[PDB]
Design an enzyme around this catalytic site. Structure first.
Site, PDB file in Angstrom:
ATOM      1  N   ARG A 178      99.670  30.488   4.545  1.00 30.89           N
ATOM      2  CA  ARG A 178     100.249  30.269   5.805  1.00 30.89           C
ATOM      3  C   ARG A 178     102.250  30.751   4.788  1.00 30.89           C
ATOM      4  O   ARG A 178     101.939  30.525   4.106  1.00 30.89           O
ATOM      5  CB  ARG A 178     100.369  28.865   6.346  1.00 30.89           C
ATOM      6  CG  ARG A 178     100.904  28.546   7.520  1.00 30.89           C
ATOM      7  CD  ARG A 178     100.469  29.898   8.616  1.00 30.89           C
ATOM      8  NE  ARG A 178     100.876  29.391  10.181  1.00 30.89           N
ATOM      9  CZ  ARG A 178     100.923  29.823  10.905  1.00 30.89           C
ATOM     10  NH1 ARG A 178      99.936  30.599  11.216  1.00 30.89           N
ATOM     11  NH2 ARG A 178     101.656  29.541  12.295  1.00 30.89           N
ATOM     12  N   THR A 193     102.904  34.693  25.125  1.00 28.39           N
ATOM     13  CA  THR A 193     102.266  35.885  24.699  1.00 28.39           C
ATOM     14  C   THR A 193     101.239  34.816  23.704  1.00 28.39           C
ATOM     15  O   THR A 193     101.230  33.908  22.667  1.00 28.39           O
ATOM     16  CB  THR A 193     102.610  36.992  25.128  1.00 28.39           C
ATOM     17  OG1 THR A 193     103.083  37.011  22.909  1.00 28.39           O
ATOM     18  CG2 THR A 193     104.084  37.452  24.573  1.00 28.39           C
ATOM     19  N   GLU A 216     105.367  34.744  12.485  1.00 28.51           N
ATOM     20  CA  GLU A 216     105.206  33.893  12.814  1.00 28.51           C
ATOM     21  C   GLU A 216     105.893  32.484  12.599  1.00 28.51           C
ATOM     22  O   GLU A 216     104.985  31.744  13.335  1.00 28.51           O
ATOM     23  CB  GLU A 216     104.361  33.482  11.270  1.00 28.51           C
ATOM     24  CG  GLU A 216     102.696  33.015  11.479  1.00 28.51           C
ATOM     25  CD  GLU A 216     101.808  33.817  11.590  1.00 28.51           C
ATOM     26  OE1 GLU A 216     101.635  35.190  11.528  1.00 28.51           O
ATOM     27  OE2 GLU A 216     100.907  33.276  12.668  1.00 28.51           O
ATOM     28  N   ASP A 268     105.531  30.476  15.955  1.00 31.15           N
ATOM     29  CA  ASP A 268     104.450  29.296  16.412  1.00 31.15           C
ATOM     30  C   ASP A 268     105.320  27.762  15.993  1.00 31.15           C
ATOM     31  O   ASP A 268     105.039  27.021  16.904  1.00 31.15           O
ATOM     32  CB  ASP A 268     103.220  29.166  15.664  1.00 31.15           C
ATOM     33  CG  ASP A 268     102.754  30.007  15.832  1.00 31.15           C
ATOM     34  OD1 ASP A 268     102.477  30.611  16.455  1.00 31.15           O
ATOM     35  OD2 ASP A 268     101.704  30.878  14.555  1.00 31.15           O
ATOM     36  N   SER A 273      99.313  26.813  13.589  1.00 26.39           N
ATOM     37  CA  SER A 273      98.496  27.444  13.441  1.00 26.39           C
ATOM     38  C   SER A 273      97.186  26.931  14.689  1.00 26.39           C
ATOM     39  O   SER A 273      97.069  25.399  14.402  1.00 26.39           O
ATOM     40  CB  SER A 273      97.980  27.983  11.798  1.00 26.39           C
ATOM     41  OG  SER A 273      96.975  29.001  12.259  1.00 26.39           O
ATOM     42  N   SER A 274      97.012  27.985  14.628  1.00 23.82           N
ATOM     43  CA  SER A 274      95.454  26.709  15.402  1.00 23.82           C
ATOM     44  C   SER A 274      93.898  28.358  15.174  1.00 23.82           C
ATOM     45  O   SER A 274      93.314  27.640  15.440  1.00 23.82           O
ATOM     46  CB  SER A 274      95.373  27.770  17.138  1.00 23.82           C
ATOM     47  OG  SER A 274      97.072  27.337  17.136  1.00 23.82           O
ATOM     48  N   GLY A 301      93.082  35.204  17.884  1.00 23.73           N
ATOM     49  CA  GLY A 301      93.392  34.683  19.418  1.00 23.73           C
ATOM     50  C   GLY A 301      93.704  32.959  20.252  1.00 23.73           C
ATOM     51  O   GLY A 301      93.852  32.586  20.319  1.00 23.73           O
TER      52      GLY A 301
HETATM   53 NA    NA Z   1      99.320  32.300  15.269  1.00 27.07          NA
END
Ligand code: NA
Length: 550
Positions: free
Chosen positions: A75, A361, A404, A407, A426-427, A447
């Site tokens: 990450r 978005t 990133e 996020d 993060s997801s 997504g």
């Molecule tokens: Na992401």
């Protein structure tokens, strides 16, 4: 083809060329990790808007020898010049996502390449030269693009029309259509340089300083010292259990595993198999569950090195019951606030619950999975935050930089606030499912925030409903994180949708694609692997059969 079967190897990726490349790696004696790396580079080439060495991801690896499941966490980190209110103007109000997505401070320290380094030095068996060469010659000699790439370029011409990406993707002002050949000479140069000097050239070389300069020129605060200070981490997966299987997924700094497992635990007792796969009841209960889970996510999730996430309380059985009080077929929960897991857990939040505007978005990543003849299992979800990330192309290197750090929460104070050297929430949800402590399934999807819903449902569709793998993937999905946001895939019956809206839901007029699942099923009793790629894109599954004496 979208579905394939192998005996000695299996590869499932989002782009056919990457699939055939990884399959080739497996074919001449390589393992799942070598193939994973080669696939990463090939995805950098053929799908530069989803993943890259200017981004980061979560790489779940099941070791065949030690029988241990570990995660290469690559990450992105924020520079130490990054500040909590860097997403706020001088008037103390949130900078619109349209400007945040493209700005310099949105860029985080790329971690993908170092992740590949760690993976290659732990489980690598082939020279990375061989693993990177096909991508080099794919960028040098070009390739005919797919519909996804073309559509992405056409939908993002404006973002690309302000960076060094135009003269490559917008030759005279026209975006490259499907069938057009994409040539990336500078990218090939970067790949060759990395082939020569290694990670050194990226984190302590010319590429690094170049990235730094272009970032600062776009308003960033990242220094080469930030790059040279970066190291990937190794994480032990988060574990749950569902219908007799042990599920291993991503812990913090990702929100995927925790709340996918939470959704599973929440909806398990309702026994959805009781109802039809396209009925009112299933969709409704799904929505009611997702609302609670995302409500908790918006308040309790963040980098574990900085904040304390209450995993133990988010998955507590009695807590699950307490939350299940709010789920019913006879009504809809209109007050969706986060629960209080801290009751069932030792500790206290060292932060506050900070409301966030929904100007996001939702971004797209890429997920892929590999399996070899030695029991090694790879499930990698890699990303630059959004399509082409910031859009910023590293000048002379033809490399896209991520955004990133968006996020993070725009408004500081919460668990996901902007902090220096901190990783944004993060997801992503790379996940492996086990039976009798042995790998049987691979689940993952891209997504952004919708990923958790995509994986969950998929898993659900496979076990609660016992559908086939491809049927479980292709079965229409839904998504909702609030009383305002709703999405549904093409396949939901119109009357069911209308009644759902009559019940208090807000499903829109037209459907959209939700996620893109590539999966590999391990049939040990038949000694074969089964690969399936989602029809949402031009994904591909390729099997590998190796003769003896080979
Ligand atoms: Na992401």
């Amino acid at each position: 083809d979208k579905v394939a079967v192998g005996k000695d190897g299996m590869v499932a990726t989002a782009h056919p060329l990457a699939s055939k490349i990884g399959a080739e790696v497996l074919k001449k004696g390589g393992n799942a990790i070598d193939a994973a790396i080669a696939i990463q580079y090939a995805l950098n080439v053929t799908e530069p808007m989803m993943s890259g060495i200017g981004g980061g991801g979560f790489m779940m690896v099941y070791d065949g020898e030690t029988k241990e499941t570990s995660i290469i966490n690559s990450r992105e980190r924020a520079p130490e010049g990054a500040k909590p209110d860097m997403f706020l103007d001088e008037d103390g109000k949130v900078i619109p996502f349209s400007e945040r997505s493209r700005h310099g401070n949105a860029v985080g320290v790329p971690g993908t390449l170092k992740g590949l380094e760690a993976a290659h030095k732990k489980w690598g068996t082939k020279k990375m030269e061989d693993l990177i060469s096909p991508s080099i010659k794919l960028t040098e000699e070009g390739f005919p693009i797919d519909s996804v790439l073309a559509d992405a370029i056409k939908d993002h011409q404006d973002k690309l029309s302000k960076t060094a990406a135009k003269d490559i993707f917008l030759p005279d002002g026209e975006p490259l259509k499907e069938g057009d050949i994409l040539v990336q000479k500078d990218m090939a140069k970067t790949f060759k340089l990395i082939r020569k000097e290694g990670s050194k050239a990226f984190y302590d070389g010319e590429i690094g300083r170049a990235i730094a300069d272009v970032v600062q020129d776009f308003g960033g605060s990242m220094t080469p010292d930030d790059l040279s200070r970066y190291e990937v981490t190794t994480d032990k997966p988060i574990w749950g259990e569902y219908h007799g299987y042990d599920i291993a997924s991503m812990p913090p700094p990702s929100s995927g595993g925790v709340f996918m497992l939470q959704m599973l635990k929440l909806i398990d007792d309702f026994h959805l198999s009781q109802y039809d796969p396209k009925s009112f009841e299933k969709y409704h209960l799904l929505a009611e569950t997702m609302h609670l889970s995302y409500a908790d996510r918006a308040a309790y999730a963040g980098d574990p090195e900085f904040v304390d996430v209450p995993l133990r309380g988010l998955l507590d059985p009695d807590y699950i019951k307490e939350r299940q009080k709010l789920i019913s077929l006879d009504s809809m929960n209109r007050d969706v606030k986060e629960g209080d897991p801290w009751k069932y857990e030792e500790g206290e939040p060292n932060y506050e619950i900070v409301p966030q505007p929904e100007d996001k978005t939702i971004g797209e990543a890429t997920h892929f999975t590999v399996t070899d003849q030695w029991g090694n299992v790879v499930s990698y979800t890699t990303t630059i935050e959004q399509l082409f990330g910031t859009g910023i192309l590293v000048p002379g290197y033809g490399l896209f930089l991520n955004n990133e750090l968006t996020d993070f929460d725009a408004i500081p104070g919460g668990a996901n606030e902007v902090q220096p050297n901190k990783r944004p929430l993060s997801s992503m949800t790379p996940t492996i499912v086990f039976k009798d402590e042995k790998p049987v399934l691979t689940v993952g999807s891209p997504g952004g925030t919708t990923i958790i819903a995509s994986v969950f449902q998929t898993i659900l569709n496979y076990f609660e409903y016992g559908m086939s793998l491809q049927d479980a993937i292709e079965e229409p999905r839904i998504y909702t994180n609030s009383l305002t946001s709703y999405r549904y895939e093409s396949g939901m019956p119109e009357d069911v949708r209308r009644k759902l809206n009559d019940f208090g839901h807000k499903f829109g007029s037209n459907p959209v694609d939700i996620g893109n699942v590539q999966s590999i099923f391990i049939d040990r009793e038949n000694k074969t692997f089964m690969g399936v790629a989602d029809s949402s894109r031009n994904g591909t599954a390729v099997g590998v059969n190796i003769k003896t004496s080979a």
